[PDB]
Symmetry: C3
Subunit: 336 residues, 3 copies
């Protein structure tokens, strides 16, 4: 399309919602290509990531870790207004893995505090894709400070399986998985800082060990458990988008499966089926489609169980409905 | 299916065999759906995991690390009797990745010492699947103490390749791979403990490093070597089921290939072909099919070669038969 | 038959250093050939970073990684492997592409002052690791750089899932190396007189499973600056990537993998529209991309700590015209 042609396209302004929720959208595309507009402010904020009061200087797209999921369709234009507020201390930018050229938008979106930019890219490829901050000289530091999220580029005709049967989700959740590298003192205590810059040297030392101190969902230990558990009902079709901008993960729905899993996150690559545990490399997002069959609490985990139950990479689903004794039954309950 | 229909189904009681062997089964299902019955006693026991005599307090399904492979067909019911003897000190349970609901069975199988339980589940999806102990609050500790195994749910029609050709193995082996985290003293020598509980806090410390001290097949360094080497012959078709309940692995047959590899372990997902090295994420089982073409010794390894040759993740095959100079020949043997 | 093999054409090929690849045709020309290669194993000190950090490398053909060898399915690869009397160690070679004798390693154990010639039939199409593998010292030889890759092209060249021909304009080979360099008490990398002096200290670092360096083409920044890879808008590029010991996750920052044989095997259909692909330790993968935008791209292991802190970052410098349909700055950074 020409510049004049793009300028003629319908503009639709989208209002983002916080992970793990996803803003309103249509699975099948509404008419021809549109310029879908989003705005996010990059917020620098202290976050507490565990019950010990451990702090991280987070870089939060739209105020969250991870930043929110943006949903467009293949061949829409994603037009992001990105804003760096005056109260911030650092330059920030954005690399969209979905985009083509200028380091994913990174080379065109470098904003100092008090600056804004507007980037437009054509979403030519269907899938779930990571985005992250990537300032030259400080790339992994910003990323492991929570400066990442994802987008979903839906096929204009919605999702399908390998064979062409439509796959339509009733619910969609976005899990952003985060590896943190929090410096400790000589007593094994996590250190605190009064400015993001103050933690830099200490953090880089920990980063180089390639061993995170915490691995969490939605920015904290227990962020997606208890009250903040994701919800479903027996018979509901759920899509779980999962991203990790820096480090590998192996998602697993304990009590469930991934009926269809785009493990690479790309919708033109046919999904794997009947998955127990899938694998998403650092720097990617994946998506799993499941229909719930049993009510109760599920644990959705990074299935390195040390990472899940020692380091924080565990979420819950709360599922309502009738128990199915055909699928599973206790023939003899625990007894002498 | 109703309770009355299931009650009407035939029962078979299977005798489990120790890994790497697999109990007598048929690849193609004989008859309609059965209720397949297994019994396992969990043993808390001291095991030696290397030639130095390093010991671990293991949690051992059926007394072995890994626990034995259970084999059923799709839409069979698996009915496990699980026994926690009174000589044990901890509660145990079981999560079948093959199963649907109650945390894979974990929520219905919490047994204290002196207790037993019977769990039935419908095997709705064909593939190889991990099972493991998963007691709330102590999940990874039990798993990395050896408390894991696998099952195989064969399609009723046996195995096929991606494209409708039947694949029939002559023999099957199950390689359970285990990451162990053994505390060291101030001179780097492995510590021993009187009771399982004594080791807990030191072991958690090593676990948090995400660096296993040992990575072994069938419970110990070199367990599948010497007169315990796996065997085949030229022309023989071998299925190799491989599981890792906690940590990623990258299986490789040195001198051979994976002709068909269900790297995700799920038989409705078409296998990769002509593989050098496949990838099995932590919390999953995979399976490779190979037809041996050359006689001699092969090493079957996790192809992080440090993990293979320093940490313990190497097995051998001894293969009998005639050498094929077409496939490979020494034109000029090592000479001055 | 014996005569049929004996009668097949023999052809000598000259190797070139990574990231470049020797002359080859994508579509096989004629029937099966015996393609002849020669490599001299060089034990040599190499510098791997900007602080002058040294490794006693084992370098097939004098390079880390060793060079890419290219043949076609059902060709034979016939390698003459030479271990100079000036070397101190025995070496051999395991071809993951080959069948038997531990990939060739059991037939190629050559002491200093020896050579050997190995022939194998390249029965399966794909990119495959090769590495040194002396019994009992396998990982030490591999993490000292003694590894490379080969490509076994389908006789009919590459195809997509629908069997449409994929023809590259150029090919690069990125060999990724995990190094495990000992440090003294003050955190300074140690140096050693002979390779064997470093053995015990090196194995200690190896057991932490934590590399000190993760590099492309044998050194931090080897494929950046005046040594960036190059392309033009519209140009079709195959990037072959190997890691003989440790997982990696390649990502073309600014680009994609249009077709990615993540397993490296050409009979396994490629994944498409890839953001970041995954290559397990002990394998090679291949990605096909058609550049759409000019500029600098970063080609990385997308554990960004490995990429930017440990060395796993390369560049592409791409010429041609910007495409505003694909991407445009609507409002440039402004106060
Ligand atoms: Cu940034
Ligand atoms: Cu940032
Ligand atoms: Cu990225
Ligand atoms: Cu247990
Ligand atoms: Cu347990
Ligand atoms: Cu599990
Ligand atoms: Cu060597
Ligand atoms: Cu050696
Ligand atoms: Cu190898």
């Amino acid at each position: 399309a020409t510049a004049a042609e793009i300028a003629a396209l319908p503009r639709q302004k989208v209002e983002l919602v916080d992970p793990p929720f996803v803003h309103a959208h249509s699975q099948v595309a509404e008419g021809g290509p549109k310029v879908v507009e989003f705005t996010m402010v990059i917020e620098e904020k202290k976050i507490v990531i565990d019950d010990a009061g451990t702090e991280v200087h987070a870089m939060a797209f739209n105020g969250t870790v991870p930043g929110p999921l943006m949903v467009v369709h293949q061949d829409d234009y994603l037009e992001l207004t990105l804003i760096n507020p005056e109260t911030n201390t650092l330059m920030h930018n954005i690399d969209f893995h979905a985009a083509t050229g200028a380091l994913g938008g990174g080379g065109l979106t470098e904003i100092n505090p008090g600056e804004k930019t507007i980037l437009r890219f054509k979403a030519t490829k269907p899938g779930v894709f990571v985005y992250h901050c990537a300032p030259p000289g400080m790339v992994p530091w910003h990323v492991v400070s929570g400066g990442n999220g994802a987008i979903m580029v839906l096929p204009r005709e919605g999702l399908h399986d390998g064979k062409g049967k439509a796959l339509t989700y009733d619910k969609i959740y976005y899990v952003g998985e985060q590896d943190f590298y929090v410096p400790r003192d000589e007593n094994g205590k996590y250190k605190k800082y009064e400015a993001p810059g103050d933690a830099y040297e200490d953090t880089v030392k920990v980063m180089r060990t390639l061993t995170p101190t915490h691995v969490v969902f939605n920015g904290a230990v227990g962020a997606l458990t208890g009250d903040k558990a994701m919800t479903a009902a027996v018979g509901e079709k759920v899509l779980i988008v999962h991203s990790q901008a820096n480090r590998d993960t192996r998602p697993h729905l304990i009590g469930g499966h991934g009926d269809y899993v785009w493990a690479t996150g790309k919708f033109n690559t046919p999904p794997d089926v009947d998955q127990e545990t899938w694998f998403i490399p650092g720097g990617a997002a994946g998506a799993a489609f499941y229909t719930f069959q049993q009510p109760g609490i599920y644990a959705y985990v990074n299935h390195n169980l040390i990472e899940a139950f020692e380091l924080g990479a565990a979420a819950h689903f709360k599922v309502t409905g009738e128990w199915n004794d055909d699928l599973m039954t206790s023939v003899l309950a625990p007894s002498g």
